[PDB]
Structures are given as structure tokens and as C-alpha cells.
Design an enzyme around this catalytic site. Sequence first.
Site, PDB file in Angstrom:
ATOM      1  CG  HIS A   1      53.908  31.295  42.121  1.00 34.60           C
ATOM      2  ND1 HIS A   1      52.542  31.086  42.073  1.00 34.60           N
ATOM      3  CD2 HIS A   1      54.254  31.219  43.429  1.00 34.60           C
ATOM      4  CE1 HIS A   1      52.088  30.861  43.295  1.00 34.60           C
ATOM      5  NE2 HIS A   1      53.105  30.953  44.142  1.00 34.60           N
TER       6      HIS A   1
ATOM      7  CG  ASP B   1      54.256  36.920  39.485  1.00 39.77           C
ATOM      8  OD1 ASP B   1      54.203  37.654  40.485  1.00 39.77           O
ATOM      9  OD2 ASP B   1      54.284  35.649  39.556  1.00 39.77           O
TER      10      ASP B   1
ATOM     11  CD  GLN C   1      58.471  36.179  46.483  1.00 42.06           C
ATOM     12  OE1 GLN C   1      57.554  35.444  46.902  1.00 42.06           O
ATOM     13  NE2 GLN C   1      59.297  36.797  47.287  1.00 42.06           N
TER      14      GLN C   1
ATOM     15  CE  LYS D   1      54.394  36.192  48.010  1.00 44.86           C
ATOM     16  NZ  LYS D   1      53.046  36.398  47.464  1.00 44.86           N
TER      17      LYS D   1
ATOM     18  CB  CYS E   1      53.303  27.673  44.296  1.00 45.36           C
ATOM     19  SG  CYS E   1      52.218  27.129  45.598  1.00 45.36           S
TER      20      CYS E   1
HETATM   21  C1  C6P Z   1      56.686  34.920  42.055  1.00 46.41           C
HETATM   22  C2  C6P Z   1      55.236  34.773  42.674  1.00 46.41           C
HETATM   23  N1  C6P Z   1      54.154  35.020  41.953  1.00 46.41           N
HETATM   24  C3  C6P Z   1      52.855  34.885  42.475  1.00 46.41           C
HETATM   25  C4  C6P Z   1      52.714  34.564  43.803  1.00 46.41           C
HETATM   26  C5  C6P Z   1      51.272  34.415  44.397  1.00 46.41           C
HETATM   27  O1  C6P Z   1      51.148  35.543  45.312  1.00 46.41           O
HETATM   28  P1  C6P Z   1      49.779  35.403  46.271  1.00 46.41           P
HETATM   29  O2  C6P Z   1      49.932  36.587  47.176  1.00 46.41           O
HETATM   30  O3  C6P Z   1      49.761  33.999  46.839  1.00 46.41           O
HETATM   31  O4  C6P Z   1      48.562  35.532  45.330  1.00 46.41           O
HETATM   32  C6  C6P Z   1      53.827  34.331  44.577  1.00 46.41           C
HETATM   33  C7  C6P Z   1      53.720  33.911  46.056  1.00 46.41           C
HETATM   34  N2  C6P Z   1      54.642  32.797  46.400  1.00 46.41           N
HETATM   35  C8  C6P Z   1      54.694  32.465  47.789  1.00 46.41           C
HETATM   36  C9  C6P Z   1      53.491  31.875  48.355  1.00 46.41           C
HETATM   37  S1  C6P Z   1      52.956  30.373  47.331  1.00 46.41           S
HETATM   38  C10 C6P Z   1      55.911  31.689  48.208  1.00 46.41           C
HETATM   39  O5  C6P Z   1      56.004  31.054  49.304  1.00 46.41           O
HETATM   40  O6  C6P Z   1      56.843  31.621  47.365  1.00 46.41           O
HETATM   41  C11 C6P Z   1      55.083  34.421  44.028  1.00 46.41           C
HETATM   42  O7  C6P Z   1      56.225  34.178  44.813  1.00 46.41           O
END
Ligand code: C6P
Lengths: 406, 406
Positions: free
Chosen positions: A122, A199, A202, A225, A362
Site C-alpha cells: 500500500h 504493516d 489488514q 478496520k 492505494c
Molecule cells: C495494507 C494497508 N496498509 C496501510 C493502510 C492505510 O491504513 P489507514 O488506516 O488508511 O492509515 C491500508 C488501508 N487500505 C484501505 C484504505 S486506502 C483499503 O481500502 O484498502 C492498508 O490496506
Amino acid sequence: HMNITDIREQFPILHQQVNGHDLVYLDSAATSQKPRAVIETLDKYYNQYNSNVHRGVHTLGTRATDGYEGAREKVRKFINAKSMAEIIFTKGTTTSLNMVALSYARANLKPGDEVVITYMEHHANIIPWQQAVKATGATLKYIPLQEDGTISLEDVRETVTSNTKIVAVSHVSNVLGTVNPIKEMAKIAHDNGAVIVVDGAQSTPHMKIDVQDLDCDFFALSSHKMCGPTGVGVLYGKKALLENMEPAEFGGEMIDFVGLYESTWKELPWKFEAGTPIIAGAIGLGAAIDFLEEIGLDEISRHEHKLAAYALERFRQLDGVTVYGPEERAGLVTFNLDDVHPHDVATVLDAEGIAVRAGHHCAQPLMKWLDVTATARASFYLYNTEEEIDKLVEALQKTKEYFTNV
Amino acid sequence: HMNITDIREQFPILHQQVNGHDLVYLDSAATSQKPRAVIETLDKYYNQYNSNVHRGVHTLGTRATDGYEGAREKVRKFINAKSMAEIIFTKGTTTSLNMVALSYARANLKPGDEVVITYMEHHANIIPWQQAVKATGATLKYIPLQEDGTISLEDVRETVTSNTKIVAVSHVSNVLGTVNPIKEMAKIAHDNGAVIVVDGAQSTPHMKIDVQDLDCDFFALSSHKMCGPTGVGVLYGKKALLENMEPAEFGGEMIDFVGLYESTWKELPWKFEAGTPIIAGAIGLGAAIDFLEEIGLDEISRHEHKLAAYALERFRQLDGVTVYGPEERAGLVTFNLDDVHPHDVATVLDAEGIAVRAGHHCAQPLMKWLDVTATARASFYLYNTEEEIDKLVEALQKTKEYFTNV
Ligand SMILES: Cc1ncc(COP(=O)(O)O)c(CN[C@@H](CS)C(=O)O)c1O
Ligand SMILES: Cc1ncc(COP(=O)(O)O)c(CN[C@@H](CS)C(=O)O)c1O
């Protein structure tokens, strides 16, 4: 075992219609819905004991402080950290990863050093490293992917060298559903003299996390999430690393002494929590953890494996649909219909009540690796059902039929 | 005019006892309480239309996005900014000020340059500048204070020079209650070639803010002090300054294009909003703004001026009590009892149900300027009353009597 009717009954938002159809929410990888236990935790906080924390020690201030630090201990137990000193509340995964890139990477990279990431990351686990290597003159490198979108440890070993200082990698891909071999990759990173940044945005919602078993050096996650409030996340880091990192933000509550020109910092974790913190959201994240632990992360994982296996089978029943990533996977399916743009797929699905995401999620370098510009993604959580997957595949069938007719 | 019974009826948390006494909450400078209109906004968000924003464009995602951007427009109107591009949602005042120190100051300071602040600043408006001048080799300077804790413009003119690049100053002091002459100080800063950074954490809740009339270059504020959720704030900056500043955080939603090694940014404001944003909290802050605007900031200011004038008079009725700061002030009183440590004052007051803060209030250099190590602070908001001030002064009288007896 977990009763999906009884679980869904706790999520008020599921019980509504969109465009005349029961809502079918299949976008939990973008954000999850909340049970009453979490929403009512926020209510009780604002109705009964809101006050600033670690400041005025009057009765409500003590209750708020105890609630905030109690939630920190819930997080510590939930990911099996050794110490609350290792548990930093942040705005979300993205901010957590940026704090590592700012306070660890920029202080520990020199020309010739490497940061190693992967093509499936991401943007939150790409751009902070791009910026840290530019600021230090270090080098950014990418572990290649196998044909099914998994990572082989042989490729990890080839890419990580004795010049690697940081390996950063997702626990679970938000696009491929791949579960990466984080524990084995941590051994490879350490063997070469690097730290590993995980990271876990997920993975944390969907499967047990044990940072002592994973032996990750840093681990980042987002509350929104995993049935928790928006606006809050966690940065875990091994205590000896956090002790040597400078704060990323400066202000009240993270100081010990402030002179005119120089200041000294609090001990961990508060060193890294400048200003009035995310009090209600952190306490609601602790409530989300209590909720998930009462159901059981292993039950939630099993439920998602059943939904993923069912979805993959039913997708294979559709002609002209391409699914990306491996057979063994987390609870999500990213796909395309032959000759239908994914944005149009998403529009038709929403007209049937079905929420999915279309775009690059993203992960632009991964779309390029996949040789597509965009994809559609259905993602599952503990309140979703096989009947909802049936509605999804039936609606894809009728989308194909509709766009072939005109 | 504003009816204080009808206003208090909206704040559930006020209606409870502490240690057998009606709660008397006099710590709103640390954090404010919330009306049902705000709490119920968060409830409705999580019960009905939570989804991630600017991502999946299905029905709930569109509702959440429209709610989030609609709250941004509420903030723009509330502080009279020219454009939503100038309104950045952050974690709070502290993060907003740190973003200016990171992305503006560290890019715009050279040896010989000056950052000018004042001895009354909160740590959030001190340490980020200490760190930015250390990182750049610039110089930090302090405007002196008059004997009553106000700032004379003559001292501002003497301290700001043609080498000053940044003046940073509070709109309202969280300790002295001083309202500083921000508009005249902005003219002095501009005349010398500097920008002015305004810490409005204590002004925004209590009095109208017009950034066009103030002509401040940056203005920072916190939701939790103005009847809004925790975990959220705003950074205002003139659009031409924000256009030239690099992001402070990197990730999803703030990019246009991401390559393997290089990325380009979104337009403002999203350039500065990395990752999933503080969706519920921002929408609840917009609800807090609607609530305050319906009552009227000018009514709230008048109410607080009445409470402050009454409190100062009644404090002067107590022997052996010292009050810090000027007669003209915002709604708060910082004080000490002769021969009673402020922590002990706070303990006895909490035993009577009365919440106040004791300590240095995150302003250690100001305590040193005042020649004290700590103080006690009662602070007022729109739900407080003269009867509560009576309870405070009666309890201080009995505190003095108690500690003189033993
Ligand atoms: C593997 C991974 N790593 C970082 C993030 C960012 O998490 P945040 O809570 O936005 O800071 C995400 C969040 N991906 C979301 C929102 S862009 C999706 O729709 O897939 C992610 O999936
Ligand atoms: C003048 C001033 N400037 C910055 C801040 C920091 O705001 P945050 O929302 O914590 O980031 C504050 C908050 N002062 C609180 C909490 S330390 C008080 O009890 O006085 C302030 O008063």
C-alpha cells in the site's frame, strides 16, 4: 461457534436499504462497521467521564486517564507485546509508518544503505520510505513477486543484503489477499542486520497477532478496520528501538523539562504522544478489542477463510472474470470483468445495494505489476455471509449480461 | 439572550455527583464537555453512514465523503477562511503547529534567521520551534511580557527584526487569560518579512475567529476544547503558503501518481491528509460548530466575560490568594493560595465536587517567569454559572481555614 445472525444484530448500520435493496456491505478492507458495544463505549465516555488525561487529577480526569491507559493495556495484551511502553497510540496505520520513517529511518540511513519493500505494498508503506531514502541518500529496493502474487523467501534472501537497514512489508495485502511470511522474513532481515517494519492494517482485524512470535521490530495497525473508531491506530515497536528514536511530534505531555531553548522527553510510551491524545477513540478501540476477543479471532479467521474459499469457487463459476492473487488468502477478492471497466462494475453493484471498491486501492505499483489500470474489490468481515456472496456473483453475472447486450 | 439552564440541559455529563457533591466542572481549558447534538452526530455516523471517504463511491461511501467535506466547509465558514483548500483536518492543535514547524519552518530557516515566540506560550507552541531552529541553525527569541502578563507592541517591534522569519504566538493564554493583539502583531511580522503562526486553541472555543481580519498566516485549533470530539483539530494556512509547503506525512489519498521511487501530491487540502482521515471526529466537529453558531459566539464571549469579571471580584474578596495575569481576560483564573500547594488545593476542591487543574499547565517557562513552580486554574465555558464560582470561592475560603488550623 460464532452465530452470524447474532453478530449482525449488533451492527445497526447493516439493517437498511440502498436504492431499494438490502445493503450488502463488501468494503470492510476500506473500513469496517461498528457494533453497539463500541458506539456505546464512546457514548458513555462523553456522557459520563470525559476529561483531559495525565493532567488535572480530579475525579473525572482520573477516570478518563485510567480508561485511556487501560485501553493501552488491552492493546498490549491483544498483540502480545511485552510492555505498554511499546504501545503508542497514533492517528492510524499511515501515521504509525510515517513515524518510523521519520524517527527511525531518517536517523539510521546513510548512502549505500537499503530499504527493501515489495511491489504489493500500500502507498502508506511506500511513500514514507521513498521520502526517507531521498532525504538520506540511501537506496530503495523491491522484492519481486511470484506469478500468483506471493513472495518467495528465496527472493527475500536475494534482495536483502548486508547493506539493508530496513525491510518493510505488509502482513496481508489489501489487494491480493496474500498473507506474507512475516516471521521468516523477520529472521532474514535480522540475519542481514536490518529491522523489519510490518504493516498490519489488514491482518490485525482478521487474525491473531503475536509480535513476540512474529519478532517484528515495528508493527502498525488501524482501529477503523477492526470495528473501532476512526482517527486512531497503534504503533508497536520493540522497546530498545523506541528508546533510541527521537519523537516525531513535540508538545505537551511528552516532555519532562522545558527550558527556553532545550527540553527533555518523558519515558515511553508518552514520549511519542504529543498534545491532548485521542482519548475517546483509544478507549473505543479497547472496546473493539474486547468485542473481537469475546467472539475469538480464530473463529473470525475461520469464518473469513470459509467466505474466501466460497467466493473464489463461485467466481470461478463466472465466465470472463479474472481474480488476482493466490488461492490461500485473507477475506477479500480483487477482480475484473472482461470488457467492463471496474468503476462501471461498482456503479451497477451499488444500484443493487452492493458496496465494493473500484480503483487502484492505494497500490499503483501493484496495478502496474498486474498489467491493469484498475480493479474491483469485494472484501469480507465477521458480519458477512455466503448469501451476500451469492448476491455479489449473481449481480456480476447480470452485469456481464447487461454490458454485452448494449 | 442565552439561557444557561437550557444550555446545561444539553450536556449529560454535568448532571452527576462527585464525592457526594454536585459536580462543578471548572477545567474546560483542559477539555470541554459535549452536548447531545455532538454525541448524537457521532452515533448517527456510526449507526447509519460510516464508510471510507474519497475511495469507494458506493452509496454509504458517498454519504460519508459528503459529510466529511461538508464539515470542512463548516470550518471554513466558521473561521472565515477564503477557501476549503486552506482548511486541513489534523489530530489537534499540537499536530497542526508541528506540521508548520516541520513543513514550513525547517524548509525556510537558515543560520541568522529568527523564530520569535513569547514567554507565555504553551509547550505545543515552544518545542516544535526549539526543534526547528536546532535542525536549521537558526535562532529562537522571546518577546518579553509586561508586569501584568500582557504583550506590548513596542516589545514586539523591538524583538522582531529583519532577520525574523516566523513569529509564533497564542491568541489566548491558557494560564494568564490574556488575549494577545494578534492583528497588530501580524502587521509587525509582515512589515519585517516574517509570517505569523497563531495558536488559537484557547480562543476558537470562546470568541469569533476571522482569519481574514486577523491576517494570520497560520492558525491552529483543537476540537476537544470547543464541544467537539477528541482526536481532531484544524490547521488553517494561507493558500499560497500551503501550496509551497511539502506534506508532513505520506501515504494514501494525498497522492496523485506513485511510481517505484517518486510520487506526486494531490491538490490542497488533501495534500496534507495522508491515510484514512478522522472521519467521525471531523463530522462531529462540524456539529459542534453548528451548535456554537446557533447559540452565538458573541453571546458565549459575553457570558464568559461576565463569569471572568465576577470571579476576579470574588477572588479579590479572599485574603491570601494571588491571581496571575491582567484584568481584561478570557474565561479562566490561575491562582495560588498563600502557604498551600496548588496540588493540595486541587485535592480539597475535588473532595467538594469541584474540578480544577494544578501544575504548570504545559507552560514551564511561564511559571518560571511568574517565579512559581506550580499554580491552580479554574476555567469556564458556556455551561458554567456564577453559582459555581460561588462554590469555588467558598471552597477556597474553607481550604485556607483548614490548612491554617493544622
Ligand atoms: C495494507 C494497508 N496498509 C496501510 C493502510 C492505510 O491504513 P489507514 O488506516 O488508511 O492509515 C491500508 C488501508 N487500505 C484501505 C484504505 S486506502 C483499503 O481500502 O484498502 C492498508 O490496506
Ligand atoms: C494555548 C494552547 N495551545 C496549545 C494547546 C495544545 O492543544 P491540544 O489540543 O492538547 O493539542 C493548548 C491546550 N492546553 C490545555 C491542555 S495541556 C490546558 O489544560 O491548558 C493550549 O491551551
